[PDB]
């Protein structure tokens, strides 16, 4: 672990912090409650959802959804967070060594397949066995209430909870996750890459830092690196299955539109 690797790991850790408002330390302190007696507003039934919705009533009417189904309202706002994280993620990639120096069409292809793998990865930071933080930790929507929603919407988030529980068990911190997200973006395995060489050289540099950092920060978890590698595989499958459910929902739910930026991501993906 040379001084250059430490630096590369902290400069990525820094970009991670300065591009993602919500991190695992903020979420773990909100969820713990040892830094405030003002817990987030809990959303467990349809009534509590409408109470919370009273805060963004303007945005609901401007999008033509206030009178739609609760399932449509939730996952119409869920799409905004996705677009935000795709933006935060794009600016985060500008910190990966040699990423900006790649062909523009490559940068899009890497983010096209990686953002949702990174999203579901970071989404674990705000999750526990009972729910997830929403609105920058101001709210907490419960896992049961998400399952109670009618099909197929109840089938959207439950798989992600299943991933997070086993993923949080690894007990990664923001230092580990920033390098994990950087690794997800630099997969030379994506379909439709022009310079498959430049990327691989860029990945092995990021992957190298991830392994060494994980061996130093979590020395007792001897095979923590291999496990995360398996977690990347799992994430690819998770996003693959996700895009399938989003297509099925776009074609069988007239009230559920697909955000333009998100459509392009999902188009001709899997
Ligand atoms: C999205 C869907 C529903 C609600 N709600 O009914 O409370 C809120 C949101 C949302 O994204 N809120 C928010 C506000 C400010 C900053 C981030 C997120
Ligand atoms: C949907 C997708 C992602 C997130 N997130 O990671 O913060 C949150 C949501 C969501 O459903 N937010 C929400 C907040 C308040 C009321 C309803 C829904
Ligand atoms: C994002 C956050 C909140 C709301 N809302 O309270 O209605 C809506 C959105 C949003 O992204 N709506 C949308 C869906 C599809 C295409 C463009 C915009």
């Amino acid at each position: 672990m040379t001084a250059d690797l430490k630096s590369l790991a902290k400069r990525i850790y820094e970009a991670y912090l300065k591009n993602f408002n919500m991190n695992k330390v903020k979420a773990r302190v909100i969820l713990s409650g040892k830094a405030s007696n003002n817990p987030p507003f809990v959303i467990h039934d349809m009534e509590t959802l409408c109470m919370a919705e009273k805060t963004l009533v303007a945005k609901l009417v401007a999008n033509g959804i206030q009178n739609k189904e609760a399932e449509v309202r939730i996952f119409h706002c869920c799409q905004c967070t996705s677009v935000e994280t795709v933006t935060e993620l794009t600016e985060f990639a500008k910190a990966i060594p040699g990423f900006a120096n790649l062909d523009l069409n490559d940068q899009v292809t890497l983010l096209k397949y990686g953002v949702y793998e990174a999203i579901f990865a970071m989404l674990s930071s705000v999750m526990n066995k009972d729910g997830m933080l929403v609105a920058y930790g101001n709210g907490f929507i419960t896992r049961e209430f998400l399952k109670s929603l009618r099909k197929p919407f109840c089938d959207i988030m439950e798989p992600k909870f299943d991933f997070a529980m086993k993923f949080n068990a690894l007990e990664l911190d923001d230092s580990d996750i920033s390098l994990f997200v950087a690794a997800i973006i630099c997969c030379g395995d994506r379909p439709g890459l022009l310079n498959v060489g430049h990327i691989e050289k860029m990945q092995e540099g990021i992957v190298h830092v991830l392994r060494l950092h994980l061996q130093s920060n979590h020395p007792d978890d001897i095979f923590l690196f291999p496990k995360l590698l398996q977690k990347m595989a799992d994430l690819r499958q998770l996003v693959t299955e996700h895009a399938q459910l989003v297509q099925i929902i776009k074609k069988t739910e007239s009230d559920a539109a697909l955000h333009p930026l998100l459509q392009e991501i999902y188009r001709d993906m899997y």
Side-chain angles (χ1 to χ4, degrees), residues 43 49 74 78 81 123 132-134:
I43 299 170
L49 173 58
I74 289 179
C78 269
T81 317
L123 187 63
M132 65 177 301
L133 297 176
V134 291

Side-chain angles (χ1 to χ4, degrees), residues 56 59-60 63 65 76-77 79-80 257-260:
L56 77 174
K59 222 184 288 184
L60 283 174
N63 290 274
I65 309 170
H76 249 256
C77 165
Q79 307 206 27
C80 273
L258 199 45
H259 188 294

